[PDB]
Amino acid sequence: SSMSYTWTGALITPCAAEESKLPINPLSNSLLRHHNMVYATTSRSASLRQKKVTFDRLQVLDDHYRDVLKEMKAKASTVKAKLLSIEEACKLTPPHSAKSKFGYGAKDVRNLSSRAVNHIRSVWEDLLEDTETPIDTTIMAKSEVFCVQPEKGGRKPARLIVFPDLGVRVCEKMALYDVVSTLPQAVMGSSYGFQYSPKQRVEFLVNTWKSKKCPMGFSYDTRCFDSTVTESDIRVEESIYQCCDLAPEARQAIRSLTERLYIGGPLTNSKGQNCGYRRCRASGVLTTSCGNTLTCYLKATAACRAAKLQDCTMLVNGDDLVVICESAGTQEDAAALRAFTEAMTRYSAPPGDPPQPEYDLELITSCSSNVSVAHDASGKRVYYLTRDPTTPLARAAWETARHTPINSWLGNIIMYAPTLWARMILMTHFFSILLAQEQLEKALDCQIYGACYSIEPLDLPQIIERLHGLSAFTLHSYSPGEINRVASCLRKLGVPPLRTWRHRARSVRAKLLSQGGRAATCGRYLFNWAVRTKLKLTPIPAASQLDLSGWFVAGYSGGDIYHS
Numbered sequence: 001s002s003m004s005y006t007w008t009g010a011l012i013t014p015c016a017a018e019e020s021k022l023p024i025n026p027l028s029n030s031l032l033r034h035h036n037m038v039y040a041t042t043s044r045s046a047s048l049r050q051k052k053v054t055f056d057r058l059q060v061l062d063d064h065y066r067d068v069l070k071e072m073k074a075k076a077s078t079v080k081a082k083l084l085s086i087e088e089a090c091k092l093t094p095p096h097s098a099k100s101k102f103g104y105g106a107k108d109v110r111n112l113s114s115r116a117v118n119h120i121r122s123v124w125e126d127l128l129e130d131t132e133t134p135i136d137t138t139i140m141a142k143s144e145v146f147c148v149q150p151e152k153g154g155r156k157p158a159r160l161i162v163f164p165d166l167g168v169r170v171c172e173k174m175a176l177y178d179v180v181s182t183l184p185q186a187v188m189g190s191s192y193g194f195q196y197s198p199k200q201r202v203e204f205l206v207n208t209w210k211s212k213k214c215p216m217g218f219s220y221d222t223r224c225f226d227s228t229v230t231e232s233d234i235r236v237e238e239s240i241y242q243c244c245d246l247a248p249e250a251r252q253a254i255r256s257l258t259e260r261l262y263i264g265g266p267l268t269n270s271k272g273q274n275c276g277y278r279r280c281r282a283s284g285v286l287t288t289s290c291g292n293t294l295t296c297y298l299k300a301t302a303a304c305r306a307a308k309l310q311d312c313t314m315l316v317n318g319d320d321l322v323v324i325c326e327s328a329g330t331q332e333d334a335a336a337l338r339a340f341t342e343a344m345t346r347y348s349a350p351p352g353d354p355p356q357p358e359y360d361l362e363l364i365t366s367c368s369s370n371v372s373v374a375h376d377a378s379g380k381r382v383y384y385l386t387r388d389p390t391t392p393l394a395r396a397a398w399e400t401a402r403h404t405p406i407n408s409w410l411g412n413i414i415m416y417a418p419t420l421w422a423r424m425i426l427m428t429h430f431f432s433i434l435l436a437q438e439q440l441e442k443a444l445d446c447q448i449y450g451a452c453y454s455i456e457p458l459d460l461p462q463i464i465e466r467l468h469g470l471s472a473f474t475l476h477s478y479s480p481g482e483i484n485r486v487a488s489c490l491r492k493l494g495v496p497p498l499r500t501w502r503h504r505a506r507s508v509r510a511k512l513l514s515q516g517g518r519a520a521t522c523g524r525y526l527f528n529w530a531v532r533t534k535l536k537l538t539p540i541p542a543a544s545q546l547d548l549s550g551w552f553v554a555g556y557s558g559g560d561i562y563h564s
């Protein structure tokens, strides 16, 4: 077999009470009135997810697969990776990262407390000495906020997360942080998605599209990607890692983590009960983003060859895959894509939805997002990435009513700043509240490509200029399709219409402007859309001075990474 999971019967348990309903709160109600449509997942649906992620995997490798692997290993051979010190590794730990079972937590780790450091050291020596004993993991149900989808069904079950102890996570950083931050670009080149800011990603897609004589593209969605990852896949990943120049201890640690953690191991619930056994990818280890990306790139590159797709360019982020190629015609494209899917299926990665050939770039969705067009102040066409705002808006409402450790609304503003909905709704709403509570200068945690950053709202204009360009503050004449998707979403969720948001923004803009300093800059740049008599926007001096060096280098979702 090789089942992805085996289960004992013990339940996946919560470690505290779980909220599932949006509260009825004046602050969140002014953004979204249909509160009954907004829910959070809980452990109560864990068994539904367990059923979905548990299955037998079929895998047959072939010459195309072996050829692509060799090519990838030859590129990995150019990489030299360094060991992180205990200090560097500790400072990469998020302050609210899950505590250890052995008497210390994240703050102790970041503070280099002797008890934390001593344990981290014992854990490391154990990786150097013990090459085989499976390492324990905890399994938990993830709490996440969605809007009800009565067409698709009703409610999504919780996702499951599997992660080792805090001490092990620190050791993973020491051995592999530099590998996972450098190796994927060296191997995959321009295909590695996490190297691109938002404006660079949209440029890559558009330039790629325009580079073909007659372009065709598709996204490919693998069903339960993490559970399709076999022990063989994980050993192949390691074989690529082992091509880097490594310190001896790093090389041994990688070999031991592979065997003891990454290929599988025991699952324990929050009550300490043996829950089952994993033989697939764990969502909460440092190598999940990097390994999923390599794995998906290897399988898809090899499947493109089998399918005989012509002049393919791929963009890969973890399990998210988009391919743009030269059309051979309607029927031959449909056939070629069916061959592609069969080859992926043999490699263990069958599709959820069958892929569909697309002949318009705007109709491809990758990393939740699609290309759209607007115009800048001078009328020039500007391309940007957008997405359906339903989930962002639901989450923003939840985050307004409940203090959460990570603010998705802030990540959405940063990453979707040129969109009609991020500008008119998210910026207006959150700047209104922060202004009212006098908290514009207080730093808030968000995630960018899975890593956690602490950001001041007042630094948004500079950050946005860097990620999107100055046109982010001047876009208008959005496409009718985009406008209509947003407006219909607002009606669905009971969010006031865009006309109301314009009225609210004029008032926030005025108050920001009144305060001078960085608030005035926010007023001037973030809300220029809200006035007829517009201000001429020049480049922001602080923008060129920003250190964004580590922002768009690699993906770290599930990897417990905090960047200062």
Ligand SMILES: C=C(C)COc1ccc([C@H]2C3=C(CC(C)(C)CS3(=O)=O)Nc3c(O)cccc3N2C(=O)c2nc(C)oc2C)c(F)c1
Pocket: 197, 198, 201, 317, 318, 320, 366, 367, 368, 369, 385, 386, 408, 409, 411, 412, 415, 416, 447, 448, 449, 450, 451, 555, 556, 557
């Ligand atoms: C630049 C663009 C505009 C388009 O491309 C993007 C856009 C966003 C991300 C980040 C992010 C998100 C939420 C944000 C914005 C709120 C924060 S984010 O930047 O981390 N979502 C998504 C998705 O919705 C879908 C895929 C991946 C991620 N992302 C992850 O990293 C990630 N990986 C896993 C396993 O789960 C998650 C959530 C990305 F990687 C690429």
Ligand SMILES: [Cl-]
Pocket: 066
């Ligand atoms: Cl092989």
